[PDB]
Design a protein around this ligand. Structure first.
Ligand SMILES: [O][B]1([O])O[C][C]C2=[C][C]=[C][C]=C21
Ligand SMILES: [O][B]1([O])O[C][C]C2=[C][C]=[C][C]=C21
Ligand code: NA
Ligand SMILES: [Zn+2]
Ligand SMILES: [Zn+2]
Lengths: 256, 257
């Protein structure tokens, strides 16, 4: 699977029939159809920068992984009773500034999207166990709007020259990704899925109402990553965003 | 104005620069069966002062490394020249794939990239501006670059590119001797030709090295990740900047070897 014409989102259903499921992500958030929910607590993130481990080129994207052996780095509050343990963050982007986000708001496409992903360590003992469970994953999505350079992205962008080609990985330490989140954590939540294979319907989404910035040139740094292995013909990672999927009667709730 | 796109690319240059259809246009294919050995060709000697290195700049279609050219600290002599020529710049050309990015070809074989090391005649002229339109004004060493092992001599140049990502950005670039980029052997071909992009002046004595240098697939990708756009506009990678070979129109390619 990938994002090419032949292996791309429109074709994922042949290998992963859940792609046509009732809880697929991302979605278009229509603000006229959201339900304000008075029981939603504020989101609480508490991340320890010592849990930052490694950055990896996974061919379609890059991942920044965290040590997830204990509760040093946790998400709480919002719609959750359980504590969720941070394991990774990554981005999605598009071939031009016009699109690149996965979630849209009232049909508006942003230039990129940050996913901060967590697993339910109250109910499950590993990511592997949690990743297929309806209540297994909690993911913060942050819409990235093209504009001013975002200096919080700096350590991340500076690391990419060490993982230019598929499979390269390097230590990535002493970093607290709550520094990438917007000032307001007002949010939408809905029950959904991973946005690429295996597309498990295991994600409670937390979509920030406030965007964060990214420059045209910062997005070019993402797009200059290579999907090919070292020594092969360079194939830039031009995009990795999935189109929005049908709500199929799910309700998007607002904290605000 | 002019570029390497279908709209404004080399096949369209003759509209704005009629000399593009001239008798001394570059690059050319070197057919080794038709080269003539000329006993009058001395060895090339380059003596470059690494304190003449000045600035690296994104020029929209390419990037240039510029040298102070106020005196003759950094000079090319020998080969077909009586005069010393003063170093002013080096730059590269590359292609959209590893299969064809050089400008000059040898027996029809296209290399992955090409280095140009450019010099102006400071014996006869007082400035680059004066020298540039003159038949005897410029001397340019071309080196063919063959995709394979990473070339560590390219390191300081490729490390500098993050400071000049968009059109018009520039940064200091100091203490560099570009003779470190040349092959070990300086056996060469020479022919009278032109600048390979506008304004296409027929002012260049070409020195094409017989020996190639290395470059990796990832090093070429670093060139292609430079942006042709100005800061703040949608990123447009510099995918290629190599002109096709032009007719010899009776010129002779002479061999030093
Ligand atoms: O974009 B993704 O497929 O859905 C969001 C959650 C997640 C977590 C880790 C890797 C990938 C994904
Ligand atoms: O590729 B070019 O147009 O012909 C080579 C010589 C030269 C020198 C400086 C800038 C450009 C060029
Ligand atoms: Na000789
Ligand atoms: Zn994601
Ligand atoms: Zn050139």
């Amino acid at each position: 699977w990938g994002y090419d014409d032949k292996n791309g989102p429109e074709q994922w259903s042949k290998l992963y029939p859940i792609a046509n499921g009732n809880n697929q992500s991302p979605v278009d958030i229509k603000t006229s159809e959201t339900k304000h929910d008075t029981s939603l607590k504020p989101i609480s993130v508490s991340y320890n920068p010592a849990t930052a481990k490694e950055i990896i080129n996974v061919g379609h994207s890059f991942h920044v992984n965290f040590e997830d052996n204990d509760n040093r780095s946790v998400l709480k509050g919002g719609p959750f009773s359980d504590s969720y343990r941070l394991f990774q963050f990554h981005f999605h982007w598009g071939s031009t500034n016009e699109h690149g986000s996965e979630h849209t708001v009232d049909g508006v496409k942003y230039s990129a999207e940050l996913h901060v992903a967590h697993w339910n360590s109250a109910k499950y003992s590993s990511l592997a166990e949690a990743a297929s469970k309806a209540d297994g994953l909690a993911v913060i999505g942050v819409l990235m709007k093209v504009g001013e350079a975002n200096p919080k992205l700096q350590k991340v962008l500076d690391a990419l020259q060490a993982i230019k080609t598929k499979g390269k990985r390097a230590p990535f330490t002493n970093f607290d990704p709550s520094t990438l989140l917007p000032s307001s954590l007002d949010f939408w939540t809905y029950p959904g899925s991973l946005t690429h294979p295996p597309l498990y319907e295991s994600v409670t989404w937390i979509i920030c109402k406030e965007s964060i910035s990214v420059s045209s040139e910062q997005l070019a740094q993402f797009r200059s990553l290579l999907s090919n292995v070292e020594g092969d013909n360079a194939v830039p990672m031009q995009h990795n965003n999935r189109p929005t999927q049908p709500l199929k009667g799910r309700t998007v709730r607002a904290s605000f």
